[PDB]
Each structure stands twice: as structure tokens, then as C-alpha cells.
Amino acid sequence: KELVLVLYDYQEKSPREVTVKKGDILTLLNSTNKDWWKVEVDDRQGFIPAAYLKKLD
Numbered sequence: 001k002e003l004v005l006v007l008y009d010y011q012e013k014s015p016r017e018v019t020v021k022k023g024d025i026l027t028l029l030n031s032t033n034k035d036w037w038k039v040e041v042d043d044r045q046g047f048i049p050a051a052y053l054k055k056l057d
Contacts, residue, residue, distance in 0.1 A: 002028040003056030004039060010052045018046030025056060 006024040018039050020026070027040035037050045 002031070004028050004037070005054040005056055006048075006052060007054050008052045010048055012046070016046055018044075018048045020048055020052070026053070028053075 004026045006020045006022055006026065009022045010018070010020045012019040018041055020039070020041060024041065028037060029040045029045060030038035031050075033050075035050050036047050037053055038045065038047050039053070
């Protein structure tokens with residue numbers, strides 16, 4: 001499972017849409033939308049703009 005790094009502080013906009021903190025590492029559940037990657041934080045999922053995220057292989 002790929003790891004991504006939350007480059008920036010991001011709060012939600014809709015229900016079940018990740019509210020990530022900075023410097024966090026995540027589980028790239030789905031990178032099939034060029035602008036909207038679906039991440040996995042702790043034991044919760046959601047989506048986060050893909051410009052707030054980075055590659056961790």
C-alpha cells in the first residue's frame with residue numbers, strides 16, 4: 001500500500017472527506033482521480049485534494 005505525505009493542513013468541506021493535519025503519512029487507498037485521491041488516516045477514510053499530498057514509496 002502506498003504511503004503519502006500530507007504536505008499541508010487541510011480541513012473538510014463535505015461529510016466523510018478527510019480532515020488531515022500537516023506532516024502526516026497516509027495509505028493511498030485510491031489514486032484514480034488525478035485531482036482527488038482517496039486517503040486512509042488511522043481508522044477512517046475520506047478524500048483530499050491531491051495537491052496537499054506526496055509520494056512515499
